[model samples]
Target: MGSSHHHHHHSSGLVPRGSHMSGNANTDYNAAIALVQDKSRQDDAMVAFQNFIKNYPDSTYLPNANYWLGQLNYNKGKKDDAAYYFASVVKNYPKSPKAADAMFKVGVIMQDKGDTAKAKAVYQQVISKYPGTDGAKQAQKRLNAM
Candidate 1:
């Protein structure tokens, strides 16, 4: 939105099966990440993502938006919001491919916040609830290393 260098056009090309939006959700999500990768434009990227979420509340990309928003908020020093956003991806979109990743992220965040016990608990939940998933594997790795 703010003259950020992103492939809004690319994202607008894949609007999902039932959605009427233009763009590819994957491209849009990737563009959002690319925008934030530039340190100088990270905040702008965050805004762009927020705008995307608002414009496509029912977009298939919502889970991804929530996960990335959580990551962005965490990087921006908003732990509580990050936790909530990541948790939302798991709770509200459990069937989404991103759910496991979101659960892993929450565990990581809890660990970062000095709540090792809670973090371990969350990690265990991931392993238990999503065995064999990417998120579960990652959580197990982190838990074993911790």
Candidate 2:
């Protein structure tokens, strides 16, 4: 059985995400990230998210917004910009479950910039914040590699 929803969204036949809610934050955010998952569609998701943030700055999945922002930027060699987004997640949404990932990328981009000291500083901050999680553990390995 699939997850059930009681909201009378629509009944225009059945298909994958074809007949569901629209226009709300869920719809907007849904279509926004849907672009990021497609191969080479990275170019589009970024702009959609920028629009998303402008439309719903009141924590409309802000953590995930900044979260994916960096991943895409990093993959595209925009290390500096990715770090900015990652940094925002940690600084502005420290309590988010994504803090470790955001913090980790900030460090990784720093190292790529030939700024080991800066990355090191960021790593330590992540280490302090997230001791046993994926990012913190990876940070430990990165520190030794440096």
Candidate 3:
């Protein structure tokens, strides 16, 4: 820990409604978030979560793991790495509720990079596929804002 952080960063659950709540690794998963929020141990969280990914490649909770890693990187302002992890969830875990939001983050990163057209393409996909989700809600706002 360093100096007290100034901003109130909220990476709220982003858990896709705990689709894998029955999985045994939920403790480890939430612990990872604890590291990110409590100790601000984002670096360690990344390592722990990466270990979880390798340890549980077929885990039903993988979407949560990947999504959090993306959140960590994005919060750190490493958008390239952030997008990489976010895309991993969107592309690999389609059925995961997290996928829609992951896709939304992908579009947000694209928009951040000044590729408005590409961003809009992804936003449209989120709106079309996950109609009622919060991800779609934000995507709609981003589209209209553009």
Candidate 4:
């Protein structure tokens, strides 16, 4: 004879879909940003930012979170990962305040990887897409140097 056992876990359903684990979107986002801002807490920040992206896909802070993730990975010398996050901001949140900066970072990443032609194209995109932003000014400087 054999015995079979099954286990099931049920959710409480107390929180709405897309709500953060803390049940507050703004608070969680702020805490995550604070973690990123504190250099000593950057590891935690990375995890928090990843969770934010997974849990708050529709958040107003999504662009900023992606930008910070890009910065964190870039600072760690993970250029590919950084570029992916930066490109996400540029592609998905083009109107966000962080979009210009993210695009500029993408260009910088390409430049650092010795892809000058791609970098130039990205810089041109920044100049055209965000003409008045500081990112555009920086892109112009980089392009002039190239």
Candidate 5:
């Protein structure tokens, strides 16, 4: 957590809107995006992500950051971490365009892990909580498939 460590007052129940940036936001943002998008450069990607989260505590990239981190964790079979990150997108950026996708990922992770009960719960949440989100539509499709 060294790279991702930072603090924010999230009393508003949304992804903290303030980012604590040091030096250049562009540099941190670029570095983080590069790391996350490069499959072979995951180590650097992780570091970049942590640094972004830490330095830009309230950056708008928070949703994307959390999404990518959740994806990385899910692909690595880190269920708990994946769920946590996905949940963060929903809780902090509920109105964010990414919310639906984030919710869908959470359900996908749960389903892949054979935790259908929890996955169903997440699916239900997406459908009910964000009926118009892309994530919610995906969730509905997955549920129907199940």
Candidate 6:
């Protein structure tokens, strides 16, 4: 029993430093963010973000994970999936730093889907709710273009 315990500890040490471990929320979150930022690893990033969302529902990084999921789906042409994730960030984490950006993306998706009236309303909401944000600036540009 003592040898088995020693072996377990030794084996655990084999895990790469900085690798995402289920119980290490910070490490997992950082790894997910790194993967998402690497465009070449988007498939891995999507998986990582999904896992992060599932495993760390109450994490401070939840909104970031949702936003990345939205971006990944959007890049893959899965507009509805992207919109859902973005909407999750907007609705569930409205005070998060990513919320306005998510809302902006939602408006863009609506416009792309030919729902101009709805898009306009969403953009207006972004502008009103996040006036000084980059989202609001982009929303203004969209509104001006209409």
Clashes of each: 8, 0, 0, 0, 9, 0
Model 5 root-mean-square deviation: 7.5
Q: What TM value does model 5 have?
A: 0.65
Which of 1 and 4 is the better model by lDDT? 1
Q: Say which candidate scores most in TM-score.
A: 1
Residue range with the least summed lDDT across 10 consecutive positions in model 4: 4-13
Report the C-alpha lDDT of model 2 over 26-63, residue by residue, as the tens digit: 45554675565455667688766665554446434655
Query: Model 4 over residues 49-89: C-alpha lDDT tens digits?
Result: 76666545555675667676765567568788878877777
- How high is the lDDT of residue 45 in model 3? 80
Q: Which ten-residue region of model 2 has the weakest summed lDDT?
A: 7-16
Candidate 6 vs. true structure, TM-score: 0.67
Rate residue 21 of model 3 by lDDT: 57
Estimate every model's Cα lDDT from 0 to 1: 0.67, 0.62, 0.66, 0.67, 0.66, 0.66
Q: Indicate whether candidate 2 or candidate 4 has the larger TM-score.
A: 4
TM-score, cand. 3: 0.67
Best by lDDT: 1
| Residue 56, model 5, lDDT | 54
CA deviation > 4 Å runs, candidate 6? 1-39
Question: Residue 63 deviation, candidate 5, in Å?
Answer: 4.3
Worst 10-residue stretch by lDDT in candidate 1? 6-15
Q: Choose 1 or 6, whichever is better by TM-score.
A: 1
**How accurate locally is residue 90 in candidate 2, as Cα lDDT from 0 to 100?**
62
Model 3 segments beyond 4 Å from truth?
Answer: 1-31, 34-39
The regions of model 2 sitting more than 4 angstroms off are 1-39, 57-60, 144-146
How close is every model to the real structure, measured as TM-score?
A: 0.72, 0.61, 0.67, 0.66, 0.65, 0.67
Query: Clashes in model 3: which pairs?
Result: none
lDDT of 5 by residue, 1-146 (tens): 47543464422234334576443444555567567667777677776676555455556665566666666666666777867877776667667645776677767887677878766787777777878687788888876877
Q: What's the lDDT for residue 68 in model 6?
A: 60
Which has the better TM-score: candidate 5, or candidate 6? 6
